[PDB]
Amino acid sequence: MLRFVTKNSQDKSSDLFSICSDRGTFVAHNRVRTDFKFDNLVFNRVYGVSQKFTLVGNPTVCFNEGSSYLEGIAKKYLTLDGGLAIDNVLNELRSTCGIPGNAVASHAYNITSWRWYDNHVALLMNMLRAYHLQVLTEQGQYSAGDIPMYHDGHVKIKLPVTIDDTAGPTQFAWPSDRSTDSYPDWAQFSESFPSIDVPYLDVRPLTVTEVNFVLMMMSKWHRRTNLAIDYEAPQLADKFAYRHALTVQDADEWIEGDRTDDQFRPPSSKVMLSALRKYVNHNRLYNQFYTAAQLLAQIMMKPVPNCAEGYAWLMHDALVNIPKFGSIRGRYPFLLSGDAALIQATALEDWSAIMAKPELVFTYAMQVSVALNTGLYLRRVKKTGFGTTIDDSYEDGAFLQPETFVQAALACCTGQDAPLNGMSDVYVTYPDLLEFDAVTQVPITVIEPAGYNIVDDHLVVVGVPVACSPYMIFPVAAFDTANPYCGNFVIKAANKYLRKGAVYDKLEAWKLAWALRVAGYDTHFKVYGDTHGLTKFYADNGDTWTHIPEFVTDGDVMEVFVTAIERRARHFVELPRLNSPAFFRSVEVSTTIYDTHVQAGAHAVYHASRINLDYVKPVSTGIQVINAGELKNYWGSVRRTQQGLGVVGLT
Amino acid sequence: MLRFVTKNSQDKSSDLFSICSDRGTFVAHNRVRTDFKFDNLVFNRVYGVSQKFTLVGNPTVCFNEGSSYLEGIAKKYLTLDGGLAIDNVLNELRSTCGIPGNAVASHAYNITSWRWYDNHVALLMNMLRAYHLQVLTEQGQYSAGDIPMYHDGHVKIKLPVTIDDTAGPTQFAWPSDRSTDSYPDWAQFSESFPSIDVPYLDVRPLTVTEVNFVLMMMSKWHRRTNLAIDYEAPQLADKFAYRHALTVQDADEWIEGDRTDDQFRPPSSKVMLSALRKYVNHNRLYNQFYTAAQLLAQIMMKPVPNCAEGYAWLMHDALVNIPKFGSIRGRYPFLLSGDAALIQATALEDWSAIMAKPELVFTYAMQVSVALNTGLYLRRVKKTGFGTTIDDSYEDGAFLQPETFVQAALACCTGQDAPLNGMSDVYVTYPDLLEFDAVTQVPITVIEPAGYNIVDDHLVVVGVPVACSPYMIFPVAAFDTANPYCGNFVIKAANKYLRKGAVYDKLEAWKLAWALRVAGYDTHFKVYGDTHGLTKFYADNGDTWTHIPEFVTDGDVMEVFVTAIERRARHFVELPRLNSPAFFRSVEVSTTIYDTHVQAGAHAVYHASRINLDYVKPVSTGIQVINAGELKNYWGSVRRTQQGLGVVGLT
Amino acid sequence: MLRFVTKNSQDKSSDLFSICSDRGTFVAHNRVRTDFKFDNLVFNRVYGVSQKFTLVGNPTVCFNEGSSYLEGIAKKYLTLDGGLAIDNVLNELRSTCGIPGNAVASHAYNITSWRWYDNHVALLMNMLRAYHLQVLTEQGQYSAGDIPMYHDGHVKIKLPVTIDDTAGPTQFAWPSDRSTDSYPDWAQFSESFPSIDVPYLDVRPLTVTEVNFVLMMMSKWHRRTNLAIDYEAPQLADKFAYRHALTVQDADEWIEGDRTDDQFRPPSSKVMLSALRKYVNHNRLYNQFYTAAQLLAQIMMKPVPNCAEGYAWLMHDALVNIPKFGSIRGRYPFLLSGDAALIQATALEDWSAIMAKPELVFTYAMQVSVALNTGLYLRRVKKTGFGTTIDDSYEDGAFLQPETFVQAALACCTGQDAPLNGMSDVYVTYPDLLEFDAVTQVPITVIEPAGYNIVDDHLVVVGVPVACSPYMIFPVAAFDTANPYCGNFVIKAANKYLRKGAVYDKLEAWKLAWALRVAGYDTHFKVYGDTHGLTKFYADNGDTWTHIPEFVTDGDVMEVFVTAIERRARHFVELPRLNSPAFFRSVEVSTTIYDTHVQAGAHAVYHASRINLDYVKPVSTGIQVINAGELKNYWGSVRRTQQGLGVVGLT
């Protein structure tokens, strides 16, 4: 994930922005300068482009079974090919247990040394989400979510929320609620020989507050806010025992009225980070934490569209496949004694980067939301080749299996090799949006129709619409040729001229429309075919980006006529008559970014924290690390090729 | 058998599905994409296929004693063969323990006329089926179970059910009755040496509740549901005694009516599995457990037939040979000690795998059911000469041996090495299915004669019909040549064209018809006989599989006249006419299954889990492992050789 | 550990100091000469430095059972691992002693469910602390013990004490109470074979009074003084039995009140040590005794801080993991016979050394305390990058493992191979000290704000402060480069001079400031921040050590502006100004400690004794010695490698 965020060490460094939101949303401001090269002279314009991101969401969880992983075991027990040496783990118990006779191995295999279902990624989800919520809490920004009330005088949209924004809590209370629901049974089991088949976790190097936090968050999660991360989650395990030298019972007392909320307020974000770092470093959970970060980032937030038709993508809900929690590392103290067993290098470097800066996960999530939303429309277009490909040889099979859905979308949008989940049966997916013809309905209020194909008072949207500017992944290089996405392009003459002298293919017509809307001239396009009532290219005043109209996507018509270019009231840099001969000049448009920052409303400016590849140096002290990986465990990167996109290892 | 289930998926993504039932049935949805590449114009079509299954069955059980197996004792008590070194036992009694010479001499004189009959296969059968029933009950769907009600709108067929679901129980009742049926005369044994030739059990490592469950489940088992694994079975031993530290009294009060039902509930599935694990790994019953697992898998369930005529497969009832219960492990306490001798490697690894994941047995049962049906059907088909040039004596070659019946069926189906029972005189058989003229009078209530072989108010079939489709096991190489059963097939030019259309061979015509029905074209055909009421390639929806046309089941029909190729009501991919010599093209297809997730009924969806075989190495400590097998015991595999399927060693 | 204490003085003049206390504290005077050689003009100054210590502490003890160690029995009763050859035990019972076959068979049947948990570490802990307390009492200075009352004339700080000295006892009272607390149910055992799984002790070689002391000291131990080694501890075993020739009755009358206090006095220190020696060398408990000695040393005492902020180090309380008491040596009389097996060489030599001189433990405790504090502080410092070019992950590298916590601290401090505990799941830890932001609210009563980080009426610290000075262990090579911690350092030219003075690096400035404060010049400095109330290099008298200036604890500060070099009130050696480029000279210093003699308070002076290691060879007769160690048991050493400190074998 770190390599993708840093765009392969571009300028040797990268950047990230802190998590922050107001009423469940936050703008993402920018400043850009767009040049103009014609008449062997330069014009330019500077304009502040914004972008709206919302944290609201209602994903659906599935705490199903998942494959067990034993990577954080000593080298002497695990093997690259032999794996778990059951004889080696068993006979070590005999040398240390007080159980007599030769039936020691039989009893141990009967009771506890048969399951081998070590997997804590659900717990890592819980704790990392808790850290993010606590950040939003003490930053004075924790509240119920609220999708913005989109309004332009024309058709307007409003989506409902589970809980009221004002009725939402102003402080982060506990996930579970005391004296309402059951809690898992826990007890410090420090015996050398396990007695009952039950998940075991080693939290010896954790302080009392950290172990209290972990064992309390072990219980059921209850949603109290509309945020996409407050998803419902039951208690991960019905029963478990924690390997701690000291006995901790503050949570147990708080179950009864013994401890009030005052004396059991949730801890601080640095306390959560210390607990998580201690836990991961102790149990050698680098790959599992990397997978946890991937999963949480993929559900962090969605980009609020600036167009009326964009809300169709926003209204959707995702499905998460979190494996059932199971922990077998406290069953035997000697398991952790020794170097870690084949920890993935990408996981290690990513873990070190997150420890250096805990904001990398949020910045990656912010990038990935925009990247996925763009990549869905991008693959829908690229499958048909603007309706100019006969067969279906684009080979979009990487979008079929729900595991690689998001990663394939990322590899489609940007040429960067999207990072694999590093696990199996775990994913976030919108199955209804699998095929490129994704019809959907939008609930719509009562406004007068102005060429917006309103059907049954419900905006009918086909597929997925591009709903966010690419300004945070600007070098996207989505199309093969030059475009606003690439950043620098040159407007060319019309293909031919006729009685209104405007013959342009959809792609360069959209290029010219975006250039003119940047320059302050709205453009009128007219095709006598299917139009649905749009005569000018759709754009937003706050965000000068011009969304590609549907007729470019449908691939039926290949030409669009731009009859007259009108001048907006908010005039800007003057241009000649482009849509006429003997006056058009080969203008070229380039843009660069001036200032990028993330602000919640207009208050408490959050200066960006620079991150470079200097601290990327992993801690290799007693951690057997392998850079290579296997596709079986989904350790690779989906890469876009000439014919399409496929999954390959990084080599 | 783990090797078989892994090679079914060629060691890539070895899927397995949780047990789940809805009224005794369920359905396994898939998502398979089929290609159509011709003239470098690659097309494809994805579609969901649902091959449903039913757990309802009424097998016939014959409890006949067979060979006595003693391959779990220490080496020093066993000779070079299975012969028990009884003289060694008495010498060890003389040497190790200090017993009066008169006492040991009297015991040795008494033992000279004792039966060393030890077979716990029936006990393992009962315990495993009880565990599965408890799993199904705690899942909340256990009931009497009913055969599916299938109708095509032209014929309505409903097989009678012995016990209806409405009157069926909802909670798992005990196999026996409350003092209504006599219980076995169990007793407590704790001395060093046996006193009566009655078999004795070693159940010391088990807990009080597990011993209660085993002892009272030893009683006569009554069939209370139409479940296939709910076969009737008598008390496995009229008298016995368990070697335990203390006597167990809880079950006796319930037996005699002192304890009511609520005071004695059925134990959990987890504790049942723990008891089974303890018993097997304590008596070292790995081989007998492997045989019992094979029997359960082969007797688990049958596939619901999509077509009408396939219900004949549901009509037939299996016959089994369960050896009588015998136990000499509890006769002496030293026998189970030492290093276990004569343990098969395949049995050990299979036992480790099934205890690591208790769903391997169920997925192997599903695979064996579908493979059995396909193997029998394609055996009948290849008897004609369809697809196979060599007219091998498939009728009576190796299908006579009941122990090798199902394994030979699997060999004929897939070509993979079917795992043998590993035990003598134990098998599952359908005696009325060896003949190739097996007809059945399936009761029908015809709505209208859509065209079938309906005779005497209830139609008949020939041999074995088709009930399933090769989708749980797709890459099955039933035929040597390319076919839909294989991954991909290349449609070739017609043998001869003519004015009305073209004629086709036995296999090529069916292959093209299946490809066209997948594409969306319904294919008509004309045959020299008039033996049916429809000139169509029947292909029921839900799986889009075109059954082998019944006309080719008989011989002397090598050419089939195919005409009238046209689109159906719905259409997926445009294809050339393929019958006229002008429009014909060398269409090549390719099929691959991507996703599969069984779901019980219409609410409970059970996502496909996964198995990490790297972590499931067997517990090889303290075990004398033997890779080789003995053909008289049927410790081997059967492979479909080009010269005829036969039993071979794994070497 | 003897190797460690000898290498601290590089095997030359291995000093050691008698235990001595004054109100729970004492002070270790020294006489160290510091050189100043420049331009062949060698100067020097001798001065007495006093680094005082306190024995007062309140550690937290968690009595949790851990791994069972059996490495003291004869070879024939032990397998290749720690597994007890119980079958060998029963065969030897059969062969050697003439016991009825029925009796031995019954005993063998009973023994099958017995716990071979044997760990006498808690017992050795208790006996050693009792011996030390009796030594301190007979020395005539035992009391409740009070924390020192330190004030600089500007802030008055006094840590609260649980038990004041005035009400504190003057004579060593018994750990238990006169029938107020229940005593363990001891008994007399003399038969050949055990009868109950309750642990049994072999105390035959001990005398009647020693057995009385051990048996009644087995009871619950109450904390009656604020001594660090006076931790509360419950009864180590509710029931037990001692293998002795005759029963012991003297203690019982005192237990039941029949015997009054004067009739039963605490036994002498000499007889306590004799009893400990007999017990250890009879049960062959060398490894467990070495572990217990390590624990006592690591938990003995803390250094009184000269500076005000160092009292935060005294605020923190340790946490320990003492394994539960277990004894199987007394189960059978033959076990202790034969040749002892699995005895570590280091443990044997350390045991011989500590019994030759019972002060080695105390001097090693003092050294481990000072090394611990210095290691933690310089770890926090080197996290910034002070002195060390490589920014190794010192935060969480190997400090997570509690068993390796203090050893890693010692490795970071000195670079010498720290001796491991030699036992699993036993450690001393400060959980609130792993984090680098550990703050404490030390209660202060400010007389006047002389300039400190005083906030909220009670100042705070960051991480771990400094309380001691590297004078008990002078040649400590904490930093790779030359420094005051090393023997000598060469002051080099300034990086850049300027009109007001010169600027200096992070390390060179502190080195020069320390050298100048030793010389007699007070050095001022200016920093880009304003984070303190004094621009001075703080150096309290009594030790003439200049603490690391707190400004450099944080990062992003590489250059420090130093000016105003001038003589203090008193002066020792004339030095050039060293800041102006003209007066600057290449001053080179050299430091060496000559004399040291701890003295308790102001009256009792304990001259430094000596140890002749030539006469302290271990008793290797009748012992199977093993030089190698097993990393799971933590039988090794940790060395500060250039690539990061880690656990290595001694080979």
Residue numbers in the entry:
A (entry chain B), B (entry chain A), C (entry chain A): 1 to 651
Please give me the paper's original passages concerning this structure:
S. cerevisiae, a genetically well-described system, harbors in its genome an endogenous virus known as L-A virus, a member of the Totivirus family, and its discovery was the main starting point of research on yeast virology. The L-A virus contains a single 4.6 kb double-stranded RNA (dsRNA), encoding for a capsid protein (Gag), and the viral RNA-dependent RNA polymerase fusion protein (Gag/Pol).
To isolate complexes of similar molecular weight within the native cell extract, we performed size exclusion chromatography (SEC) and reproducibly collected the resulting fractions in less than 8 h from harvesting yeast cells (“Methods”). After SEC, we vitrified fractions 5 and 6 that include megadalton (MDa) assemblies (orange dotted line). In the acquired cryo-EM micrographs, large unperturbed complexes are visible, including fatty acid synthase (FAS)44 and polysomes as well as prominent circular signatures. To first explore this signature, we collected 7011 movies at a pixel size of 1.57 Å and performed image analysis of the derived spherical signatures, resulting in an icosahedrally averaged cryo-EM map at 3.77 Å resolution (FSC = 0.143) in which an initial backbone trace could be built. Simultaneously, we used ModelAngelo47, an automatic model-building tool, in its de novo mode, enabling us to construct an atomic model within the EM density. The patches generated in this process were then compared against the “non-redundant protein sequence (nr)” database, a task executed using the blastp suite. Mass spectrometry (MS)-based protein identification of the fractionated cell extract verified the abundance of the L-A helper virus (Gag, Gag/Pol), and also the presence of the L-BC virus, albeit with lower abundance, after adding these endogenous protein sequences to the available yeast proteome (UP000002311)22. Compared to other studies, we succeeded in (a) mildly reducing sample complexity and rapidly retrieving L-A virus in yeast cell extracts directly amenable for cryo-EM; (b) identifying unambiguously the L-A virus using the high-resolution features of the calculated cryo-EM map by Cα-trace model building in a supervised and unsupervised manner; and (c) probing the environment and components of the L-A virus by quantitative mass spectrometry.
